[PDB]
Amino acid sequence: AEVEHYEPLQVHVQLEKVYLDGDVSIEHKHEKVFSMDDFWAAYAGWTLVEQKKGYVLFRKQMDDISPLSKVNGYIGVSDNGVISTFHGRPEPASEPIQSFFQIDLERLESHMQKNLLKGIPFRTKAEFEDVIEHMKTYSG
Numbered sequence: 280a281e282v283e284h285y286e287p288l289q290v291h292v293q294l295e296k297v298y299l300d301g302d303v304s305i306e307h308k309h310e311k312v313f314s315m316d317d318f319w320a321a322y323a324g325w326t327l328v329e330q331k332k333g334y335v336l337f338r339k340q341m342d343d344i345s346p347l348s349k350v351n352g353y354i355g356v357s358d359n360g361v362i363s364t365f366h367g368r369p370e371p372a373s374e375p376i377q378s379f380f381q382i383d384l385e386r387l388e389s390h391m392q393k394n395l396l397k398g399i400p401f402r403t404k405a406e407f408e409d410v411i412e413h414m415k416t417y418s419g
Contacts, residue, residue, distance in 0.1 A: 280332060281332055282315070283313075283314045283316055285313055286313070291333060292307075292309070292310065293307055293308075293335070296340065297339070299348075300348040301379060302344075303377075322335075343404055353366065353368070353369065354399045354410060355395060355397075355398045356384065360417070361378060362378070362379035363377060368397060369395075379414075380418065386417055
């Protein structure tokens, strides 16, 4: 619907950085573009999540968990086997970064869930996806 102009277009493009963790760095860019087509070419690699006249939402994701996740690394499940990452102890006094999936902890191996209950003290990327592949392995 957007047109190609000569007079610039102030696009507020939200650039997400999606990490494996679940955390995503939200960036806000406002750029003037003359040709929206050049703008599209610019972020062609990014995943266009939505666009409206004035604001565009793109995400670019990596196979890394984020630099902050190597300081945090806390994967926390809620009692419903909620696969969410948290900053620090996964408790209601903390906030869920996202929400991936839910699984039965009763069907979990007991000490697996317990680790997830207090939160993993540290995770590297492959260790994250290891525990995550283990989580999805229940999937209920």
